[PDB]
Design a protein around this ligand. Structure first.
Ligand SMILES: O=C(/C=C/c1ccc(O)c(O)c1)O[C@@H](C(=O)O)[C@@H](OC(=O)/C=C/c1ccc(O)c(O)c1)C(=O)O
Ligand code: NA
Lengths: 109, 109
């Protein structure tokens, strides 16, 4: 199996299997409704989500990168923000799609 | 020009041009020494850095994702942490390489 950061979720290997249960904790993933969790990149609107994912160059160019050495190991930390184009005619639908998946786990077991 | 998150830095379109100068503010990237800044993905050790960058699936699976509406526009926020494999024979070289680039800008004239 690939390193966690290189994994690709699909119906055969879903978001929970690849990335763990969604939840509220720092360094727990919070993104995905039940349909996306189950289907990963097989999700019918995956392209409209993936348009916001950074290239490796942009991940290392845009982000605040840190390194932490703790009792669990050595961790590369990252924070950043990606600006949506509010002049894109698809902007309202993009906001609706992203909001549908952000913290969706709070509404189901 | 591509949306910022899809840009690829190269010798012709470098990290400063693609992603802005390195600096300490939360809106700036902090990653890259003078050689990676000038070369982007032409950098001789780029693969050893890119191995830590998340797939589109992992970026949305591992990260804490948010949406912030501020005076400057609408932002998709991301945070998370990637564990190094201390059983990787290249672990000690990965630590040295990441230490060369994190906040390297502090040493520039
Ligand atoms: O990267 C740039 C911009 C380059 C550029 C612009 C327009 C062009 O048309 C072009 O071809 C290139 O400069 C910086 C910026 O903007 O302040 C960028 O600095 C550096 O890496 C400098 C490092 C350094 C290290 C050791 C030294 O001894 C020394 O003298 C300098 C940063 O700190 O992020
Ligand atoms: Na160290």
């Amino acid at each position: 199996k690939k390193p966690r950061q290189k994994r690709t979720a699909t119906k055969a290997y879903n978001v929970t299997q690849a990335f763990g249960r969604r939840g509220p904790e720092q360094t727990q993933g919070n993104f995905g409704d039940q349909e996306l969790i189950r289907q990963g990149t097989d999700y019918k609107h995956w392209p409209q989500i993936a348009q916001f994912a950074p290239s490796a160059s942009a991940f290392f160019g845009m982000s605040r990168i840190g390194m932490e050495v703790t009792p669990s190991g050595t961790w590369l930390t990252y924070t950043g923000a990606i600006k949506l184009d509010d002049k894109d005619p698809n902007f309202k639908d993009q906001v609706i799609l992203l909001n549908k998946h952000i913290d969706a786990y709070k509404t189901f077991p």
